[PDB]
Ligand binder design. Structure first.
Ligand SMILES: Nc1ncnc2c1ncn2[C@@H]1O[C@H](COP(=O)(O)OP(=O)(O)O)[C@@H](O)[C@H]1O
Ligand SMILES: Nc1ncnc2c1ncn2[C@@H]1O[C@H](COP(=O)(O)OP(=O)(O)O)[C@@H](O)[C@H]1O
Ligand code: ALF
Ligand code: ALF
Ligand SMILES: [Cl-]
Ligand SMILES: [Cl-]
Lengths: 431, 431
């Protein structure tokens, strides 16, 4: 005796509860490396990734604990190794972060805590290891090694000088301060040593902006997924454009899904998309579509090579496919109402949830990380899922993100994330 | 104007051909390392993987060229570095393999050539690099480093002593010969050096049976996928059991697909499966199901924890879902006949192909590589796809593999692959 859950449609054993109804290991990811090595960029982008694929992850940025504890930054003097008081403030900030890590993992349902600090000494890492061990937490280390002066300078310009630590600073003096800050750490810096001392630690060393990796003792599937991700991201700037198919005939009829073709306005969008792309004047631009006709017709207007992904097809509405929202309310009032109250987890009978979409889209996201400029012509539910990943929107908000017809979303890197610009292509469509 | 292809259902631009109709880089993977380091095991298992996911791959095992050129092996004396004639035979075998690599990649449609030899000197690798460069082939190196005497001995016992090179040998003398063979290579062995000399090569060094990896300059998505795979396989023995759901009510009716429940014989299978598993007497056994009721009912009979994968659900027959094969022939004679002539690539309208299945199953296969003992309770088309991967069956044969109801397929490692044993659980079912 199994029953199907109403929202997610999962078969579960009938729990004929008795008259008194009665009701693995979390991981600490330890960032390691000199200042302006990408530790915070990695921490946030990895966390963005892990949350989107359904692993509860949170960043514990010790520098933010320090900013909050100390109130205003004046100089690199705070980071001198001979600075006894600042050392103990720094240490207290780390312990306060660790307190919060313990609470997040052991009491708030978190799976992955990203412990973002320098962690450049064996003694500090021994301290974190002791803490993970006493809490039954796994520990995975990510060290970023970058000795290239151009990359470090560029990192300082891009994220440091505009930091609230330097609000009372100009660029040249910000840069000069930050360079001296970095030199404070150099004498005591003990890089991870997997071939000797760190033999037994689970780690990845990311070398020269991802050109080279050293990987030791991956222990489980989450570490395995983390490593895979870290090995496929790159820092060089690029643009991602996302749009729906031009309006289609089912849009005109208010019928959901199917495989209908472009209306005459959908085809006007497709020509305008073509003019938009040409005006972007990109050296190389990849174009991706789903396998549904409306996206492929749209891409055909571009006269560029394109590639079809079945993983980009619109959410499968199962028994509701091809129905209007009025016929859904009437034939399946119960299904309509379940969906409205739990829109992310809700599965159409014999169809999909947004949650299912996320899993189908995982390889699309991994390949997008590998690409440079890309235009993705897709579908409402798909686009929302992709946008949530790029803009770090939660599961609960994902199915409501605003993704109208005939509008390009243009995503560009700024600092520790993505900026979105909307470009409406001035072609009417149903609402 | 787009038309949908008949077999694969792909939208393509109508090719209104004129009256005269007119009609990237391949990769050489270079194995590196001492004898009995797993080079051939890796070459074959990687190739098995790449072919199953649709990348045409072939192994060029230089040792097999040498076996064929020289006729009978007597001793390690053949591999002495002072052996002028054998050196030139070895070199000629390598060049003949390279000739075949060129032909496979440049003329036969191959994408990945796995060049399986020792390749232990910088001079030999320079030679292969020159060959890839002059052919416009990419080159990716995989070195296996293993200094553990227990692993090397175990490798010799498992694959070497039973080699046709040692047909006129007993174990002790086979082992002794092979150890001296290995020592021939040690003086001239130049390991890959990514931190200096090999700075510019695309490579992975696999260290101590996958405990540690060094990765340099992954150039593209195929190398990226290769690395991911190599990092998630392990050599320790284990068993995989595969079976269909116990017979279901749609089986009884000859209706395909749906989400029907177990018949009374399907439930007798489920109890017997339970007794079969208990008799296997495994320490730890993972159980995986799809999200369709019939597999989950089957797993419930086991009283073990199990995990549901949507990726394990039966092929989606789209418009043919829930129809009998007689109603399919009658309503869709054309679809019936397209399927019969091209069964792997054929997609049901609004449904799936075996090809689609393979893509959905990729993460199931990657996680299976990470596991130890696993029982997968699934569905006919799924099981066939999985079996093809484990038994290295081609795409064309995959949809015909024999996968009857109420029968466990038990897969165990032997040498460079998997052995299958069939265990019928003595419970009748429709045919
Ligand atoms: N692996 C890497 N090596 C060096 N720099 C990187 C890496 N990944 C990202 N970056 C750069 O790091 C910059 C941000 O540095 P940040 O993360 O604030 O450093 P940290 O936390 O180490 O002080 C971004 O400009 C990004 O381009
Ligand atoms: N990374 C590895 N390191 C060491 N041994 C391995 C590795 N991977 C597989 N093996 C073992 O290699 C054995 C087969 O060796 P083989 O592939 O014939 O070696 P080679 O081609 O280097 O002479 C198998 O028993 C398998 O267990
Ligand atoms: F049918 Al749509 F975005 F409107 F996939
Ligand atoms: F319905 Al089956 F194997 F018979 F999935
Ligand atoms: Cl310091
Ligand atoms: Cl030799």
């Amino acid at each position: 005796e199994l029953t199907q859950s109403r929202v997610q449609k999962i078969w579960v054993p009938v729990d004929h509860r008795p008259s008194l109804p009665r009701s693995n290991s979390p991981t600490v990811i330890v960032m390691v490396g000199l200042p302006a090595r990408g530790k915070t960029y990695i921490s946030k982008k990895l966390t963005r990734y892990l949350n989107w694929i359904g692993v509860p992850t949170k960043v514990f940025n010790v520098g933010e604990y320090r900013r909050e504890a100390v109130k205003q930054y004046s100089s690199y003097n705070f980071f001198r190794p001979d600075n006894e008081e600042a050392m103990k403030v720094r240490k207290q900030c780390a312990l306060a972060a660790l307190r919060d890590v313990k609470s997040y993992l052991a009491k708030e349902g978190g799976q992955i805590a990203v412990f973002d600090a320098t962690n450049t000494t064996r003694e500090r890492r021994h301290m974190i290891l002791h803490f993970a061990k006493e809490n039954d937490f796994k520990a995975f280390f990510i060290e970023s090694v970058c000795d290239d002066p151009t990359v470090v300078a560029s990192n300082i310009m891009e994220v440091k000088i505009s930091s609230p630590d330097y609000k009372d600073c100009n660029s040249a003096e910000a840069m000069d301060d930050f360079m001296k800050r970095i030199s404070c750490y150099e004498a005591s810096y003990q890089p991870l040593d997997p071939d000797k001392c760190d033999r037994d630690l689970s780690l990845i060393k990311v070398i020269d902006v991802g050109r080279r990796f050293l990987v030791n003792r991956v222990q489980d599937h989450i570490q395995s997924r983390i490593v895979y991700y870290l090995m496929n991201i790159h820092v060089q700037p690029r643009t991602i454009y996302l749009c729906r198919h031009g309006e289609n005939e089912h849009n005109l009829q208010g019928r959901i899904g199917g495989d209908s073709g472009l209306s005459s306005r959908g085809k006007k969008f497709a020509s305008a998309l073509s003019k938009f792309v040409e005006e972007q004047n990109l050296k190389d631009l990849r174009v991706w579509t789903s396998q549904l006709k409306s996206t492929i017709q749209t891409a055909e207007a571009l006269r560029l090579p394109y590639e079809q992904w079945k993983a980009l097809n619109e959410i499968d509405a199962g028994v509701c496919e091809e129905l209007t929202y009025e016929e859904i309310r009437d034939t399946y009032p119960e299904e309509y109402a379940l969906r409205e109250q739990d829109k992310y987890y809700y599965r159409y009978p014999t169809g999909e949830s947004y949650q299912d979409l996320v899993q189908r889209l995982e390889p699309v996201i991994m390949e997008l990380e590998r690409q440079e400029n890309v235009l993705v012509i897709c579908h409402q539910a798909v686009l929302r899922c992709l946008l949530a990943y790029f803009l770090d929107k939660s599961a609960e908000e994902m199915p409501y993100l605003k993704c109208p017809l005939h509008t390009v979303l243009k995503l560009t890197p700024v600092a520790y994330g993505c900026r979105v610009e909307s470009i409406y292509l001035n072609v009417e469509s149903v609402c």
